[PDB]
Amino acid sequence: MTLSILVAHDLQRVIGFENQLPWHLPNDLKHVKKLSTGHTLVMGRKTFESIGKPLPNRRNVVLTSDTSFNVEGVDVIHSIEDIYQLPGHVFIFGGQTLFEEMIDKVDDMYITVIEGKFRGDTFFPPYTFEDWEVASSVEGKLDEKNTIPHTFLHLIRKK
């Protein structure tokens, strides 16, 4: 399983609002860092500009049509087909455009379900558990810093 989706979405599959995350969940950032460190993130241009700096200790690949894009510490690709040449474990990082382009191609999905309803303008595509086996489902821990219930799902495409 070398090609995966990595996403956090709420009960209505909202993933973003005005180029930011609608929630603050440190546990989920830790989850991303644990899964992706030492591997490769592929993300759309808008998601990269939301993040600003590339994330440390992993390969950052940005998909953009902009031939002027040349950011220190960032690798640039210009086509969806470029993804299939990246070595190692590749995580599709978002945003909405990337997720829709890749949900039918990935081997598996690491989904953080945020158990709330936020205002969004960007969405993860609908998906059915008739196509996806639950490899694991783990409730996130609530504390002073993580106040929204959340569940970590690992889904694997059924054969």
| Known binding-site positions | 6-8, 15-20, 28, 44-47, 50, 58, 63-66, 93-98, 101, 122
Footprint of ligand NAP on 93-122 (CB under 6 A): 93-98, 101, 122
Say whether residue 96 binds ligand MMV (CB under 6 A). no
Q: Does 4 bind ligand NAP (CB under 6 A)?
A: no
Q: How many CA atoms does the CB half-sphere of 127 hold within 13 Å?
A: 27
Give the dihedral sign, CA 53/58/63/67.
positive
Candidates 4, 40, 47, 60; binder of ligand NAP (CB under 6 A) is: 47
Phi, psi of 33 (to 5 degrees): -65, -40
How many residues are recorded in the chain?
159
Copy the structure tokens of residue 88: 């190692």
Say whether residue 3 binds ligand MMV (CB under 6 A). Answer: no
Site string for ligand NAP, 10-39 (x = CB under 6 A): -----xxx-xxx------------------
The SS3 of residue 111 is strand
Q: What is the DSSP letter of 59?
A: E
Q: Buried b / exposed e across 118-129, counting CB within 10 Å, b at 16+?
A: bebebbbeebee
Looking at beta carbons only, is 34 or 130 nearer to ligand MMV?
Answer: 34
Interface residue list for ligand NAP (CB under 6 A): 7-8, 15-17, 19-21, 43-47, 50, 63-66, 78-80, 93-98, 101, 122
